[PDB]
């Protein structure tokens, strides 16, 4: 029972950790500006910042 | 403009006007667009086919260079018209109008009596209201309206009266013909806002609605200038099964929308109770503001562009529809709490002002900071 219980714990920890990595990836990927033109907008905006 | 002559050359190459296919193909070769991308390829083809049909006056399916040049000429004249419609020229500072009277105290309120041209300014902590010119800021009379600080000064055209409400629990209606107080009426409570509502219907008497600290709109007929009714407000004493309709904070303003016969009351609780002025019951409660709403205007530029505009503790103005509960639009770019929203009559221009002297003039057709 203890081995099995730790085994489903390992299942849940692994799946939760994969969901974690995906959530940080989503958080980083949401860098798109808005709308609409998302990256090119501030790329040309970055051009003027230059 | 560089490929104008090249397009002219290719169009003349047809010799009988470019049909749909050659027309579109020539503008596809010449345009600064993505010919290889099917999306804009097809979209530009459709737009140019629409242009072709519009140019098609003879109906033969041929658009001559003559017709194309005439259409370009018409578009050039329209651009000459440097608004593309309804030129909304910027509000320049009045080089000819400025304050003249020595206001001994800070300006508290200013109600412009367009009917009288009496720009009655109620001075903060000043027992006299100085009525200037809205066109020249020329004070007519510095007359003691009441015994204490005055909150609101509204024109009752129904009796040619300037009603001034004071924290002394009094309302003084002064005959504008002589600026003498025609009638003084005592009230159990101080009304923070006091607006003359003359609803559109001929049979509805004009009501000076006064929203005091109790959130109850005390309704004074403009003839007798006396209270005759109280609208719903946050009244914990009246503990019964009646649904909570109204506001839990003192009435800041009362907006008579005579077109819709709606008394709009904006409260510190962020509610905007639309009361049926015919019944004074709640037709609705606009919500979405983060804090107390203080100023309300009614942009009536077009029936299809009608928008209530609400501002207050929120640093941005919410656009509201009588049917559509959700705020239609939100004017951005404001750095501080918006003093209010104005909808200039006869123009699509709505002015939203922050506390830091920053004003944005927006086109209700687009609600953009023109």
């Amino acid at each position: 029972q203890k081995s099995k219980e730790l085994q489903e714990l390992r299942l849940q920890i692994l799946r939760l950790r994969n969901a974690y990595v995906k959530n940080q990836k989503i958080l980083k990927k949401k860098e798109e500006l808005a709308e609409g033109l998302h990256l090119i907008d501030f790329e040309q905006l970055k051009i003027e910042n230059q | 403009q560089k490929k104008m002559y090249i397009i002219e050359k290719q169009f003349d190459q047809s010799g009988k006007g470019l049909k749909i296919d050659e027309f579109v193909r020539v503008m596809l070769t010449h345009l600064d667009f993505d010919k290889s991308d099917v999306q804009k390829e097809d979209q530009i083809t459709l737009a140019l086919i629409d242009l072709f049909k519009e140019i098609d006056v003879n109906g033969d399916g041929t658009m001559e260079w003559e017709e194309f040049s005439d259409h370009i000429i018409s578009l050039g004249l329209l651009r000459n018209d440097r608004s593309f419609k309804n030129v909304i020229k910027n509000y320049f500072p009045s080089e000819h109008i400025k304050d003249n009277q020595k206001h001994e105290t800070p300006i508290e309120k200013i109600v412009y009596f367009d009917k009288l041209k009496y720009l009655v300014v109620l001075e903060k902590d000043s027992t006299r209201f100085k009525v200037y010119n809205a066109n020249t800021a020329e004070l007519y009379y510095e007359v003691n309206a009441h015994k204490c600080a005055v909150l609101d000064a509204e024109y009752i055209p129904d009796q040619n009266l300037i009603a001034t409400s004071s924290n002394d629990l009094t309302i003084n209606f002064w005959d504008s013909s002589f600026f003498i107080p025609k009638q003084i009426v005592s009230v159990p409570e101080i009304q923070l806002c006091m607006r003359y509502a003359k609803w559109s219907t001929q049979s509805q008497p004009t009501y000076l609605y006064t929203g005091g600290s109790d959130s109850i709109i005390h309704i004074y007929d403009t003839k007798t200038l006396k209270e005759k009714g109280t609208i719903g407000g946050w009244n914990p004493f009246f503990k019964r099964d009646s649904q909570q309709y109204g506001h839990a904070s003192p009435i800041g303003d009362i907006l008579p929308i005579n077109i819709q016969t709606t008394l709009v009351t904006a409260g510190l609780d962020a509610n905007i109770c639309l009361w049926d002025a015919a019944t004074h019951l709640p037709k609705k409660e606009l919500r979405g503001h983060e804090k107390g709403v203080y100023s309300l205007d009614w942009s009536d530029f077009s029936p299809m562009n009608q928008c209530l505009l609400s501002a207050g503790l929120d640093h941005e103005a919410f656009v509201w529809n009588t049917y559509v509960k959700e705020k239609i639009f939100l004017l951005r770019g404001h750095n501080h709490p918006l003093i209010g929203v104005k909808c200039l009559p006869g123009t699509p221009q709505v002015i939203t002002a922050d506390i830091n002297g920053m004003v944005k003039v927006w086109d209700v057709r687009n609600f953009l900071c023109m």
């Binding site: 609409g36 033109l37 040309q44 | 049917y323 509960k325 239609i328």
Partner: protein, 50 residues
């Protein structure tokens, strides 16, 4: 009176619901107006950038 009482009824809820549908379709009208306006400016912006 009894026959007419059996007869009379209705249509107030229908009036209100039709007003509600007007409301919803005006909502969608303005939503699509805003979407079309958002997409219009990008056309000229991208022509200008090209």
């Amino acid at each position: 009176n009894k026959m007419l009482q059996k007869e009379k009824e209705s249509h107030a809820k229908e009036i209100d619901e039709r007003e509600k549908t007007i409301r919803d379709k005006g909502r969608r009208i303005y939503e699509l107006k805003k979407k079309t306006q958002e997409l219009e400016k990008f056309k000229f912006v991208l022509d200008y950038k090209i």
